[PDB]
Design a binder for this molecule. Structure first.
Ligand SMILES: CC(=O)c1sc(CCOP(=O)(O)OP(=O)(O)O)c(C)[n+]1Cc1cnc(C)nc1N
Ligand code: SF4
Ligand code: SF4
Ligand code: SF4
Ligand code: SF4
Ligand SMILES: [Mg+2]
Lengths: 1165, 162
């Protein structure tokens, strides 16, 4: 049958049928494969063995690989899904699985490796790093090929005993939705070699016929024993060929080890692998029809590389070959596939000029215009070798010139682009539209979706194609027949109408009438609309959703408008499929919600109005651009073009060679995505600064100013007298940043005043006013205040050094980290684990960490997911070494002819170099005397002072902070975190516990509580939450504290300050509410208060320093809970979706909270 | 050196002796509550080892057995290898306990301390193995911390048994 799937689902479909066990661990973009396999097991889908697949989630990809090996050695057919850094951790086990000849299939959504920077996007870097493990490697070029070749891999591995890596391009294929022929499980089982499966069972470890495997061998037999597996590899190519013939007879689709396409007398041939083959074949068809003698060799079975099967498909007329590799091996003579082609042709004396290139690293676009550029390079007198395609390399001059733009799309293919907002329903609707057309027409359908790094309010661009011929266009849409914009704010911001065909369709969602079109649309846009004679349609979907009662959901409304004008299918048939899909989507909803979505379809059809524009629009002239502000070179040359969706145009000379970026760049974004912003009521405000404390984006802060500094203030900058003996004679004001606020509503909820001093007002009504207010507050001079930073009110007067990140609205993680920068940000270094905290904390080109007026701020670095603790541990050793080098140079200065005041500060620094305040005090004393002391010296004395001046950046003691998520701390990095805590080094570990893998969509973890439902835990987690804090207490010298900002502000302040001052390891586990819980982010702070008050989350502090003072180290900060336990669980969707078996799990959760509280009461006694 | 190496023991990668104390693997495994944990030493009690092995296999769940294994790297006469394990337990150097999760389901305390009162001298045991005598100024400072930590660990296991 025909279904619309993506590469991930197509792979999991085959993997589920052929496997008994599947040990998995989540990593983008391979995690959808394991997610859908777990759901099928939860609903009881049977494999070819009549059982449900057993899915086991491990602590890391290393643990998964070991489990695969053990499951295979004990007699169970097992598979797994991984990619990129996860595949690297499996490489050691892959050598064993290949060495022991165990049948196995790894499904890999090939993704770039983290080098100078992280990239979750697709290339072959990960697969190439395992090409020497002895695994076979099979490449799929399309979603249909993922379906077919996954079956080829699972069938061949049983026959050959050689394990297979079946890999496909990350995102470009794993997330591309296509209508494909799906193979039925019953048809697969008729092709399985059951004799081979039974033979695999006999090789299993069993006490009734025991054997020994994995021995240790001396030099006398090791070489021979390694060569004893040679026959199995020699026969593997022929086995895959015969298996490919089996699939061919079943499906009719013919695969070979290497496939050829193009002119039979071709002289220029490209050899490639993966999704690029689709783009190349599409281009080859276009060029061959135009008479060019070109061809393409698709590599399916990369390892073992069969010279016989490659030369069999190489036409004898080939004179020049260009090999394209989707990876980069720096310093290597060539990339892997290029070296193989060059080798095999040399071994057979073929006089063929071979040239290699690189393309598509990290999902770089690779379109037919580039393919012709590769072909044109073969036609030059001297073809450029070791080239790149898709970039402008103006440094090393390896890039090929994209001369002209060609359109190789087959005639009759429809092409659409959809500009949407984050989570507004656009992407989901397009997925539904593809399923509609694919299920009800003979047309092939394709969908690809471009997402943003910003988690909320980001831009999404959908690329859809439909045609009567198979869709090989594995690239973004170049010439669109229809363009839809679901957010009027994009009008004038992005080049929406780029490349639209003459006479195409432009669909806009806006409240603007035909007359307002003259004043609202920019001149360049009006010129394109008129010159290209576009059919311009408009619809006020927001007005419709308000009148119907759907709120602001416009997904159904805009989808109806699309089918009405696209003319892809009969309009009447489209309306039926939409309403039929509405029943499938809103059938479980109430009867009132069902008829509302029906009214959306009906009202949308009558509200869609075509805009008849005057022909004079073609002559419209742009308005005079304002005087541009002098921005930094990085902002002007890098950040602006990237945010303008033009980053692909930046040449190589734009970037640093080591992936280093400046700090404090998010303050230049000013996205202004909030629907509502807080308005401050000066008369109700008690000056508590809690609103600045809980803001997940630092968009609201208190400002102090002497009355003289308020001279040129606007009339709306209303202030009040400052409360407190420290701020006597000063003015006070709580000011919000309108363009940086997210509209989450946490600050309005936390305001404890009698009358609410913060009320959510719409942005557009107060945007002009609040902009001038914030611009004035930012230009206020620094104000020296003596408020105690240990209090909540006093701490918020310090400048936040973490601002305007890409975290979601109301995120529960960023308020913790923001507070740390306000206390110790002047002198801290951050080692941040991979995860959400690294995504909003370090996504190029914007950096949310900033500096104060002196230019000092946190230095931020992220290594890998599993090594974050040891990453920061190494930093501590180096910083200690850098302070040791300085202390040696200062001690030599004591014996030098220097000022007596200089010696006093130097001796004072040496005595207190390990104290934060004393080192800053005497360190700043040394800094003040340095410029004059150098001027008064000469000769060797000047050189001794110049060496101290070179190291003055290490006078102030540093504070190492290791920040990471619960998935890092509880699972993959726990072994490393355990080691760093036991060492006793002066490090501070901050665990942002969201109880899930938040970034990758919310998968199960050891931090997940009993009964909680998340991805990889469809039926709920049975085992209880692992107590990380209890294990760290077993050392006795590790400071452990459990905090929750929403529950107690004072308890969080005490634990953080005690943890930082403790000369030893400190562990802070903070509860961070997240959108993956399924709650209203408006009450994120309130949800943390209910969690502690109901006994769900404990608050304690384990102070080893109290043990040295003869006191009890364990202090329970909240002993008696007052709220109901079951009532807190029912307030979050992550527990209500389980409801049945839920009542059995809820009882275990309540009993564990009483036993955990009773366990803490015994330790406190 | 390992995390299992005790305080003051001299081994490769620990020329000056290991400062941090031995990681308590059994204590962390008991935090789950459903993991069977037992600490045994054959030279000390033949009957105690028999009970832990049979209880561990029959337990329908995870079991962790930490067994003291004398080694030539300790620097002892291997003729008294069994005797060295007896002297280790009798001096409070190695604990003998059994944490049975099945006892928790029966309303009883899961932790059973199999050796409550040590009878041998703790400092005297260290001088009988080469891996501790090779440190010999600062060595006497490390032995006092090791002996104080061993007494605090025994008082902790007596509190867990109640
Ligand atoms: C970014 C990326 O590739 C992420 S973020 C993440 C889990 C984050 O969950 P955590 O609880 O630790 O933090 P949180 O997001 O704040 O909830 C994974 C598994 N990955 C994939 C992954 C897998 N394995 C390895 C070695 N590296 C990475 N980056
Ligand atoms: S509404 Fe949310 S983002 Fe806006 S200022 Fe308040 S807390 Fe910050
Ligand atoms: S939370 Fe309310 S009372 Fe407190 S500073 Fe903010 S606006 Fe004023
Ligand atoms: S932790 Fe949750 S709320 Fe915060 S940015 Fe990540 S997904 Fe969004
Ligand atoms: S005594 Fe010998 S065999 Fe036994 S653990 Fe020590 S080195 Fe290994
Ligand atoms: Mg998390």
């Amino acid at each position: 049958p025909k279904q619309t799937l993506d590469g991930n689902t197509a792979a999991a479909h085959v993997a589920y049928a052929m496997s008994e066990v599947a040990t998995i661990y989540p990593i983008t973009p391979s995690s959808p494969m394991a997610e859908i396999a777990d759901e099928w097991a939860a609903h009881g889908r049977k494999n070819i063995f009549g059982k449900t697949l057993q899915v086991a989630e491990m602590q890391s990809e290393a643990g998964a690989a070991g489990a695969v090996h053990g499951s295979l050695a004990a007699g169970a057919l097992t598979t797994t899904f991984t990619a990129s850094q996860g595949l690297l951790l499996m490489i050691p086990n892959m050598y064993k699985i290949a060495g022991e000849l165990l049948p196995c299939v790894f499904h890999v959504a090939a993704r770039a490796l983290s080098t100078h920077a992280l990239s979750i996007f697709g290339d072959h870097a990960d697969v190439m790093a395992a090409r020497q493990t002895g695994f076979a490697m099979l490449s799929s070029a399309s979603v249909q090929e993922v379906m077919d070749l996954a079956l080829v891999a699972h069938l061949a591995t049983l026959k050959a005993r050689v394990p297979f890596v079946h890999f496909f391009d990350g995102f470009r294929t794993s997330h591309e939705v296509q209508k494909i022929d799906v193979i039925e499980y019953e048809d697969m089982a008729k092709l399985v070699d059951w004799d081979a499966i039974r033979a695999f069972r006999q090789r299993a470890l069993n006490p009734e016929h025991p054997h020994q495997r994995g021995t240790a061998q001396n030099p006398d037999i090791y070489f021979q024993s390694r060569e004893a597996a040679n026959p199995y590899y020699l026969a593997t190519p022929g086995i895959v060929a015969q298996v490919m013939e089996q699939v061919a007879g079943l499906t009719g689709r013919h695969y070979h080890l290497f496939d050829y396409a193009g002119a039979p007398d071709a002289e220029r041939v490209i050899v490639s692998m993966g999704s690029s083959c689709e783009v190349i074949e599409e281009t080859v068809n276009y060029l061959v029809e135009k008479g060019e003698k070109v061809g393409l060799i698709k590599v399916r079975l990369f390892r073992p590389f069969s010279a016989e099967h490659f030369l069999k498909v190489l036409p004898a007329s080939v004179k020049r070959i260009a090999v394209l590799d989707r990876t980069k091996e720096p310093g290597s003579l060539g990339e892997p596939l290029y070296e193989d082609v060059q080798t095999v042709l040399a071994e057979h004396g073929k006089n063929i000029l071979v040239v290699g290139g690189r393309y598509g690293l990290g999902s770089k676009e690779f379109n037919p215009s580039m393919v012709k550029a590769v072909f044109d390079n073969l036609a030059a007198t001297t073809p450029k070798n070791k080239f790149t395609v898709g970039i402008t390399d103006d440094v090393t001059h390896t890039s090929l010139e994209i001369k002209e733009h060609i359109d190789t799309s087959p005639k009759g293919t429809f092409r659409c682009k959809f500009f949407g907002l984050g989570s507004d329903g656009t992407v989901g609707a397009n997925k539904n539209s593809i399923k509609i057309i694919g299920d009800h027409t003979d047309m092939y359908a394709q969908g690809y979706f471009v997402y943003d790094s910003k988690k909320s309010g980001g831009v999404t661009i959908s690329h859809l194609r439909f045609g009567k011929q198979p869709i090989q266009s594995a690239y973004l849409i170049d010439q669109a027949d229809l363009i839809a914009c679901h957010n009027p704010s994009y009008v004038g911001r992005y080049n929406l109408l780029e490349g639209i065909k003459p006479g195409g369709i432009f669909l806009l969602n806006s409240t603007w009438s035909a007359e307002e079109m003259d004043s609202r649309l920019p001149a360049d846009m009006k010129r394109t609309i008129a010159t290209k004679k576009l059919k311009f349609y408009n619809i006020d979907a927001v007005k419709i959703a308000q009148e119907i009662g759907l709120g602001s959901r416009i997904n159904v409304i805009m989808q109806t408008a699309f089918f009405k004008i696209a003319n892809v299918i009969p309009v009447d048939e489209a309306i039926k499929y939409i309403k039929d899909s509405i029943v499938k989507t809103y059938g479980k909803k109430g009867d009132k919600i069902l008829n509302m979505n029906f009214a959306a379809v009906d009202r949308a059809l009558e509200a869609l109005e075509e805009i008849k524009y005057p022909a004079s629009w073609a002559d419209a002239v742009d308005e005079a651009a304002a005087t541009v502000t002098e921005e930094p070179e990085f902002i002007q040359k890098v950040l602006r073009p990237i945010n303008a969706l033009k980053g692909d145009e930046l040449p190589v000379s734009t970037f640093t060679p080591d992936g280093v970026f400046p700090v404090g760049t998010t303050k230049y974004e000013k996205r202004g995505i909030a629907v509502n912003i807080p308005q401050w009521q000066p008369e109700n405000c008690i000056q508590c600064n809690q609103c600045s404390l809980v803001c997940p984006h630092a968009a609201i802060r208190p400002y102090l100013a002497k009355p003289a500094d308020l001279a040129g203030a606007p009339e709306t900058f209303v202030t009040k007298d400052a409360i407190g003996k420290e701020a006597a004679g000063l003015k006070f004001r709580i000011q919000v940043s309108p363009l940086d606020c997210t509209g989450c509503g946490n600050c309005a909820d936390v305001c404890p005043a009698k009358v609410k001093a913060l009320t959510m007002v719409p942005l557009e009504e107060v945007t002009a006013v609040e902009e001038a207010n914030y611009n004035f507050a930012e230009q206020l001079p620094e104000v020296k205040v003596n408020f105690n930073p240990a209090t909540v009110k006093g701490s918020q007067f310090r400048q936040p050094l973490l601002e305007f990140s890409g975290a979601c609205a109301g995120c529960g993680e960023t308020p913790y980290v923001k507070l740390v920068t306000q206390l110790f940000g002047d002198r801290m270094i951050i080692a941040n684990a991979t995860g959400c905290s690294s995504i909003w904390g370090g996504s190029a080109p914007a950096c949310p960490y900033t500096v104060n007026r002196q230019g000092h701020g946190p230095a931020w670095a992220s290594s890998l997911f599993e090594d974050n603790a040891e990453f920061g541990y190494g930093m501590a050793l180096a910083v200690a070494k850098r302070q040791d080098e300085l202390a040696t140079a200062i001690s030599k200065a004591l014996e030098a002819p220097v000022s007596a005041a200089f010696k006093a500060a130097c001796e004072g620094w040496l005595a207190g170099k390990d104290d934060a305040d004393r080192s800053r005090e005497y360190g700043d004393r040394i800094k003040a005397l340095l410029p004059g002391e150098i001027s008064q010296a000469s000769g060797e004395v000047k050189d001794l002072l110049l060496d101290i001046d070179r190291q003055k950046d290490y006078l102030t003691k540093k504070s190492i902070w290791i920040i990471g998520g619960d998935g890092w701390a509880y699972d993959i990095g726990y072994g490393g975190l355990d080691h760093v805590l036991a060492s006793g080094a002066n490090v501070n570990v901050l665990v942002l516990d969201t109880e899930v893998y938040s970034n990758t969509g919310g998968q199960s973890s050891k931090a997940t509580q009993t009964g909680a439902v998340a991805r990889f835990a469809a039926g709920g987690k049975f085992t209880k939450k692992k107590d990380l804090g209890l294990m760290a207490m077993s050392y006795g010298y590790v400071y452990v504290a459990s905090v929750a900002m929403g529950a107690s502000h004072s308890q969080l302040m005490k634990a953080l300050i005690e943890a930082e001052k403790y000369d030893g390891p400190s562990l802070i586990i903070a509860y961070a509410p997240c959108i993956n819980h399924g709650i209203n982010m408006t009450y994120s702070q309130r949800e943390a208060k209910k969690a502690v008050e109901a006994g769900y989350w404990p608050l304690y502090r384990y102070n080893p320093q109290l043990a040295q003072e003869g006191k009890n180290p364990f202090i329970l900060d909240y002993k008696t809970p007052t709220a109901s336990f079951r009532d807190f669980l029912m307030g979050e969707i992550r527990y209500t979706s389980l409801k049945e078996k839920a009542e059995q799990l809820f009882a275990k959760a309540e009993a564990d909270a009483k036993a955990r509280l009773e366990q803490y009461k015994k330790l406190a006694e």
